[PDB]
C-alpha cells in the first residue's frame, strides 16, 4: 500500500446527444467502479462541445476509448454500449497492468 498516485487513465470520446453515447458512460463506469476501482481513472470529452479536441487527437468517430497509461498508448474503437465487450476489453487491460515488475531485468 506504499505506492501512491500511480493509476491508469482511460479516455472516452463521446457526443452529448445520442443515447448509445450517453449510456456508454454508464456501462463503462459500472464495470470500472466495481471490478477495477482505484486502479483506472476515467476522462470524458464531449466532441459536440469542443470539436477541435477530437481533431487534435485525430478522432473522427465516437464513442472512442483511448488508453493513456500505462504506455505505449492504445486506441480502442467499437460498440461500448455492449457491457460484455467492454468488460472483456477492460479485463485484458487489467492483466497487462497487473503483470508489472520494477527493474526485473531478466
Amino acid at each position: 500500500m506504499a505506492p501512491l498516485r500511480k493509476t491508469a487513465v482511460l479516455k472516452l470520446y463521446v457526443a452529448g446527444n445520442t443515447p448509445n453515447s450517453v449510456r456508454a458512460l454508464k456501462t463503462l463506469a459500472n464495470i470500472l467502479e466495481k471490478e477495477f476501482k482505484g486502479v483506472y481513472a476515467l476522462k470524458v470529452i464531449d466532441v459536440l462541445k469542443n470539436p477541435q479536441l477530437a481533431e487534435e487527437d485525430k478522432i473522427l468517430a465516437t464513442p472512442t476509448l483511448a488508453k493513456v497509461l500505462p504506455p505505449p498508448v492504445r486506441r480502442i474503437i467499437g460498440d461500448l454500449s455492449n457491457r460484455e465487450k467492454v468488460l472483456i476489453a477492460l479485463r485484458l487491460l487489467a492483466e497487462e497492468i497487473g503483470d508489472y515488475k520494477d527493474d526485473d531485468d531478466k
Binding site: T7, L25, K37, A41, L42, V44, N50
Partner: protein, 117 residues
C-alpha cells in the same frame, strides 16, 4: 459509493487529483463542463469543480446540480479561489497540497448517513 467526479478544463490539476483519490480507494471521473446531463449520467457521491471555467459559469453548474440532486444526496466542492457559494459543503483554495486536499475531501465525506454502503 466511492465515485467522485471532477470537472475542470485544466488537465494537469485533474490528473493529479484523479491519481491521488484513486490510490486511496476512490474512483475519479473527469468530465468536461457545460454538460449537466453527463454529470447526472455519472451521478457521484460528491462533485469537484476546479476553477477557472471558460466554457461555463461556476454558479450555474452549482445551481443546476442543486435543482436536479438534493444537497443530502450529492455534495459539491469547489477548488480554486473564494468558494463562498451556497450549496457548497467546503471549498479548497489554490495552490493545494496532496495531504491538504485529501484531508478536506475525507472530512467533507462525513455527511448524510456517513456509511460506506
Amino acid at each position: 459509493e466511492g465515485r467522485i467526479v471532477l470537472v475542470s478544463e485544466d488537465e494537469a490539476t485533474s490528473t493529479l487529483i484523479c491519481s491521488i483519490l484513486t490510490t486511496a480507494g476512490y474512483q475519479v471521473i473527469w468530465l468536461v463542463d457545460g454538460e449537466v446531463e453527463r454529470l447526472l449520467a455519472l451521478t457521484p457521491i460528491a462533485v469537484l469543480l476546479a476553477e477557472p471555467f471558460s466554457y461555463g459559469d461556476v454558479q450555474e453548474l452549482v445551481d443546476q446540480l442543486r435543482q436536479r440532486c438534493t444537497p443530502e444526496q450529492l455534495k459539491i466542492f469547489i477548488l480554486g479561489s473564494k468558494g463562498n457559494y451556497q450549496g457548497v459543503d467546503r471549498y479548497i483554495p489554490l495552490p493545494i497540497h496532496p495531504e491538504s486536499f485529501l484531508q478536506q475531501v475525507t472530512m467533507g465525506l462525513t455527511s448524510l448517513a456517513t456509511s460506506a454502503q
